[PDB]
Design an enzyme around this catalytic site. Sequence first.
Site, short mmCIF file in Angstrom:
data_model
loop_
_atom_site.label_atom_id
_atom_site.label_comp_id
_atom_site.label_asym_id
_atom_site.label_seq_id
_atom_site.Cartn_x
_atom_site.Cartn_y
_atom_site.Cartn_z
N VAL A 165 3.57 28.37 18.30
CA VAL A 165 3.99 27.98 16.96
C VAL A 165 5.50 27.81 16.92
O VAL A 165 6.04 27.06 16.11
CB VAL A 165 3.55 29.01 15.90
CG1 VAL A 165 2.04 29.06 15.82
CG2 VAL A 165 4.10 30.38 16.23
N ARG A 196 15.07 33.71 24.78
CA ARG A 196 13.84 32.93 24.98
C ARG A 196 13.80 31.64 24.18
O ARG A 196 12.85 31.36 23.45
CB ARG A 196 12.62 33.80 24.66
CG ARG A 196 12.57 35.04 25.51
CD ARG A 196 11.28 35.81 25.41
NE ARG A 196 11.15 36.70 26.56
CZ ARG A 196 10.11 37.50 26.78
NH1 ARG A 196 9.09 37.53 25.92
NH2 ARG A 196 10.08 38.27 27.86
N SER A 251 5.34 -7.12 2.94
CA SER A 251 6.28 -6.67 1.93
C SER A 251 7.68 -6.79 2.53
O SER A 251 8.66 -6.98 1.81
CB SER A 251 5.99 -5.23 1.50
OG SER A 251 5.98 -4.36 2.61
N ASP A 278 -1.52 1.00 7.40
CA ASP A 278 -2.03 -0.09 8.22
C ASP A 278 -1.40 -0.04 9.60
O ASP A 278 -1.98 -0.51 10.57
CB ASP A 278 -1.79 -1.45 7.54
CG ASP A 278 -0.30 -1.81 7.42
OD1 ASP A 278 0.53 -1.44 8.29
OD2 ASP A 278 0.05 -2.51 6.44
N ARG A 296 15.93 30.92 -10.53
CA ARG A 296 15.49 31.79 -9.45
C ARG A 296 15.79 31.19 -8.09
O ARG A 296 15.61 29.99 -7.86
CB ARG A 296 13.99 32.07 -9.54
CG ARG A 296 13.68 33.49 -9.98
CD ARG A 296 12.69 34.19 -9.05
NE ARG A 296 11.67 34.93 -9.79
CZ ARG A 296 11.91 35.89 -10.69
NH1 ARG A 296 13.15 36.25 -10.99
NH2 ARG A 296 10.89 36.49 -11.29
N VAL A 350 -8.78 8.18 -1.06
CA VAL A 350 -8.36 9.56 -0.82
C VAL A 350 -7.48 9.58 0.41
O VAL A 350 -6.52 10.34 0.48
CB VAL A 350 -9.54 10.55 -0.64
CG1 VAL A 350 -10.17 10.90 -1.97
CG2 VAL A 350 -10.56 10.00 0.35
N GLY A 367 0.82 -1.19 0.00
CA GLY A 367 0.00 0.00 0.00
C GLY A 367 0.86 1.24 0.00
O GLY A 367 1.83 1.34 0.75
N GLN A 398 2.00 32.27 8.28
CA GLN A 398 2.65 30.96 8.20
C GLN A 398 2.25 30.11 9.40
O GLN A 398 2.47 28.90 9.41
CB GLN A 398 4.18 31.09 8.13
CG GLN A 398 4.77 32.07 9.14
CD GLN A 398 6.29 32.19 9.11
OE1 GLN A 398 7.02 31.21 9.24
NE2 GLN A 398 6.78 33.42 8.91
#
Lengths: 119, 727, 712
Positions: free
Chosen positions: B511, B709, B106, B151, B548, B280, B10, B645
């Site tokens: 974050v 920090r 596998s 799985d 670029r 999906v 898979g 972001q």
Amino acid sequence: RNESCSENYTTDFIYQLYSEEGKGVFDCRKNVLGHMQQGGAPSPFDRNFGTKISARAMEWITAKLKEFTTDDSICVLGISKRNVIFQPVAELKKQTDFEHRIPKEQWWLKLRPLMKILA
Amino acid sequence: SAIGVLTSGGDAQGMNAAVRAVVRMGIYVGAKVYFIYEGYQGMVDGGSNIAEADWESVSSILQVGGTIIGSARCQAFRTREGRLKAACNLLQRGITNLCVIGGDGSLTGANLFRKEWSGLLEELARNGQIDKEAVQKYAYLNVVGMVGSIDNDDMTIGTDSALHRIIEVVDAIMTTAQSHQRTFVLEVMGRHCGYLALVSALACGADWVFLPESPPEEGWEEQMCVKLSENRARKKRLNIIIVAEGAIDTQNKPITSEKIKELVVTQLGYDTRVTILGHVQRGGTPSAFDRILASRMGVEAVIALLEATPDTPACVVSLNGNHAVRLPLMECVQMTQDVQKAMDERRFQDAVRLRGRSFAGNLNTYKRLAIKLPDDQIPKTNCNVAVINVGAPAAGMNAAVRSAVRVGIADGHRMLAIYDGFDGFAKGQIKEIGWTDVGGWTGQGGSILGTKRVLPGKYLEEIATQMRTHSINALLIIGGFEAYLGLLELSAAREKHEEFCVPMVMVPATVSNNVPGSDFSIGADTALNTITDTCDRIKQSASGTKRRVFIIETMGGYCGYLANMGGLAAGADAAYIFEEPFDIRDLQSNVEHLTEKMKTTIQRGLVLRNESCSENYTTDFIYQLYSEEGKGVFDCRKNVLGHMQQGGAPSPFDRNFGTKISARAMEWITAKLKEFTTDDSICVLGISKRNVIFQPVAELKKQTDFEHRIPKEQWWLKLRPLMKILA
Amino acid sequence: SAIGVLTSGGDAQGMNAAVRAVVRMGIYVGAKVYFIYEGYQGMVDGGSNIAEADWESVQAFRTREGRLKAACNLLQRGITNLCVIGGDGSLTGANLFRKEWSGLLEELARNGQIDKEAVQKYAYLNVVGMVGSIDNDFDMTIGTDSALHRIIEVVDAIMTTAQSHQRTFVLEVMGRHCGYLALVSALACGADWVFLPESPPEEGWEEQMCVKLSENRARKKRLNIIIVAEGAIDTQNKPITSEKIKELVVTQLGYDTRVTILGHVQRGGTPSAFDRILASRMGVEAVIALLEATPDTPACVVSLNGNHAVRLPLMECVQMTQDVQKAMDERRFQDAVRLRGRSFAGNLNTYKRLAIKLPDDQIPKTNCNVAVINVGAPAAGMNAAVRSAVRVGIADGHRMLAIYDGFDGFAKGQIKEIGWTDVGGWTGQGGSILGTKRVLPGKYLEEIATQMRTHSINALLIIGGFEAYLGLLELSAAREKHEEFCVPMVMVPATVSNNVPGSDFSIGADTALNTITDTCDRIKQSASGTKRRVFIIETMGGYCGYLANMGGLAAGADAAYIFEEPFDIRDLQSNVEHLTEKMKTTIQRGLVLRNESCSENYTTDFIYQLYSEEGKGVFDCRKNVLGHMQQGGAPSPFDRNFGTKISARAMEWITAKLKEFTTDDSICVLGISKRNVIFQPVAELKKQTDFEHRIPKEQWWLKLRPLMKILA
């Protein structure tokens, strides 16, 4: 640093590079002189310079009027070597870098090695 | 000397990142790497199906799902004739090292291929190739496996991505199910493992989940329907039931989704709809987590391949929770078979055991957050526990609050919500919060309570008074560095204010991931995935313009986490951070390297810069240097991502992180209250190594760079060499 | 006097934007707006199910007894105007309600109302409908684009897994009676086959499809995608199930086939930028229609006809539904597809000529060489455009030439003949595979001419932005000196900016708009609880205000500063004060968009500082410069189809010209004006161009400027 010497390597750029690589050894300060460079009272040399060439230029004007025109009627009165001479603008075009508004050939460049020498 | 890489079974998202890491790390150490297409079938077929890999081959595949070198269920490999063929084809290329990326069996095929390698003597008996080839390549078959399926038979490649896909679907469905009070039964991918299902349910606050390891007990139908009816009583406009495809009875009977729909419709007469998500779940783009995981794993696979000896058994390169490890293969196959054996003889509980601590924890948290006991059945402590958000907002704060509040209530506490951090705390913005109040919060971004950066220092009196007027017996803070500073300050203020002599614990939410005592912080993963997406888009733009280099400035303050991990997952050419000093030579070096890169077919550059990595070497500075020195070779563009972001709604990882960690924090609080000052009464609950630990803030002081920090030592710095290697 | 708005049958994304537009435009024109919850049933029930809307807010009806109830409840609130947003049958109830308005007299016969309400209250029941369903039997409707987004998202995800073996995916999408969504999905994902309810498959289609799939495996296409509408039917009006299609492929070809029924996700997700803008415009037009209504004006349905707001009389719409159905029962399928409109047939024909190839021998080879190129900054949908151009070109018997890296590669002779298979799978690819550059051809005219001579380029198609237009102008000028340029040249507009003269839309702009809206949605999600914040966001577009304006509109921005509309410090101050007052309300947020080149002095920083300082005691700010991410990732479905179709049309023009040394009409820009795609000689477009700011002198979307303040 000449203000327009580089597009990327600005005054700020150079300041940051020197600052960072010099850290344990020296620190920097940045100054942009500005329009004060136009001066206050003109230096004695500039006073006499303006006086003198303007006088000669006017002499030329009077000579010309004492005689409809050509190319030698529109001139730049400048200092070349040991003399002040009249140059038709047409001759000067090929002697001009119009992109950067500087003369193609500048005498004082020959003095460049002196900087390093005089450290 | 030569490495063969293939993908079997898979397909996981991040398989390409794995293959890329294997190829590049392989070339890096001076080995020849070969692609083996169509999994084992390519190995058998040979010819065009085994092709040499160069540096450029694995470019522009990282951000892409599936496996570029493909996968197919080989049948001929299960026969000795085919294994002989494969062996032959391998020997032709001098391949004696194998990296197999894929599912469960596998790997067993490779393990068996390992034990059965004496087919060469057979082919020597059958003169298919001359001798002296025999002895040269014999007992020298090196094998390493990489778990690349959803799985999940530890963390495996693609799970996070699949979870992303599922939660994306769920979030999308939530917008349509305002049209009537609908019930959605979602079938997710699990034929034997219910991890994906469990974690999905936990990430979306599902009303019910069905797992193959833990079947529902009799009579679950009545309970489930009463739960749903309670939800309509609570006037919840929606219902989500997560179903593993292999959902089973206590009698090993499958529980279909249609059966569930039929149940809800027949008993409650509800508008119920079934959705089988299907492949999906396997598709889409690999998340930052899967990209980074896969990269680290591929590299570790190559290292393992080099360090292997004939005595060294075939191993599976794995993550046993944020450090690289090598597990003996046969042991793993035996674990899978152990669980299987347990499900068949219906030892469901030890099966759940066999799944590991992570599984049982996820499950226990889900249960205690999904099912509430009636108040009469709650012993009730006469204690008041406070919840607060301090610092900048972080995606997953609301999930954390939900968890804390509900766990607290289940443990018989009266929960109090403090709004807008210490600002609101000092202003007396305190309201008793309930079970229903936090409902549906899990997937909500930002901070519903409100959070502020302000430290308690200036309002120690005002807060103390509040803590006394409201009788706050304990405090849980969900926040960033400021939360830690706050804890330090209150700890200091204890002697002058008795109100602070209560147990206080914080969970890291930012974050930036700059809180000392934790390897991860809530909200960081969401930011990483947003950053990686933006970099994918930018990389695409550079790819279409060509020649670029983009200089991209990231967030994080002095913390290089986002810039580094983001650079890694994005495939950046460089990521400049404060934690690693860099001078003009390093910059020039990278410039020269990119110059060389522009000669190749991949004429693009991606340079990340942590916002505070240098006072002099700014984003502008780097841009000017690269621009000037790149003249005639490439030009640059500068992009400052800005705070966007950070992302929007929390990633599944951040949701579950907040949920679990906060639940634990509350458990600590209840344990402490079940008894006065000292130092361990004020802690940071953080992730260190494979474990979650409580650390007194006083101990964390010596491990902190208060000037910038950031923690004095950050684990992920050890991953710095990977960037250059994989770029 | 009073407007009532309700939703019946609706399942589409962008409905809230419609309701919002109705409420606010209503209050704006000085009318009282009321929400009517629970559709018509709310109208009947009365009480709480009808609540007055203010700026911040933002079975029985089939019995005569219930219509009497509803009429009464409306009269209590002075509600006399009805806007119904919803499905097929949802409007007919309102129309009959309108015609039956003499229920008022019945209520005077009873004691339900005094007499002075009859005369003050009969003959003005003005009714306006809005299509708010995705399966509309009864033009573009709200929710269509969003659903298309959802489907194409699913498809894009499935495509990466269908390399694990050569899988063939049969995807069941939403179409019970309309096949638009299926068709357009297929066009957007380059589906290998599609099944529609209006157009059943023809004779021996099973074999044709299997042949197509086997051809795909021959060409080594690692996957197959078949789009199936829910109501897929054969010529005998019996259904064609997805299960059956899978059975066919498995039996005949033995391929690894999977069925996926997308379902309700199609109805879910966030409204697209297009749907948000469309819905806003629709609501506004609905309120306008309600005011402009007379007792003689029949009840109408508000629609968008070629980027223009129109009012269609209802009964014409139902008569259309009945005509199509009548054709369906009588198996006049071609008459049905005909009745669907030109757009439908066009989408269908383009899809076919791009999906099915004739063997070369059956294609009369013209001995012509046509070149395709990308010029300017990248735009999402360039690759789709190249694919379309190349395949139509091949189908028309041309030898296709691909020019890489714009005029830079053109001058360097980076030219390679391209084939049908080469452009396969390009549709959903963002950026530029050929490569694109902003550089103009002027300084390399000799170098390019030489190449056009060595490769014998007989025609040129450019997919690009303003630079493409400038290039065309330069080559047009260069013709006399270089005979090689005396070939037909046409361009199709491709840029995020939408600044190409002669076109109302450009490829890539929609994707950008969705990038802006996505980002604003995420911003809204993050720090959702923080309050007293104004976000200043800088967009792309150059001097073109399209992205900033439309983006602001779809985002619900408080302001969008553009170059096309000058603003001074007083204007800025006015907006600052406005936001200050806004912070007294319940919606304590601000969103200010700034076109990057809108002002030389009033920068993003400047605006941020002004807002921050003057907002000190009231709110704080955050600044964002979106950057090149606005070029997008995968192209939006709209941009994909736009590229495909416009390029196809362009190639048709080219083949027509070659079927006939040149003048001015041989060098054109193919652009969208109002409702048509027209070819315009570049020389004619000069008079319409601001070359100093690289924007068109006249831009349609500017008429939408007043909407921003109105929708706050």
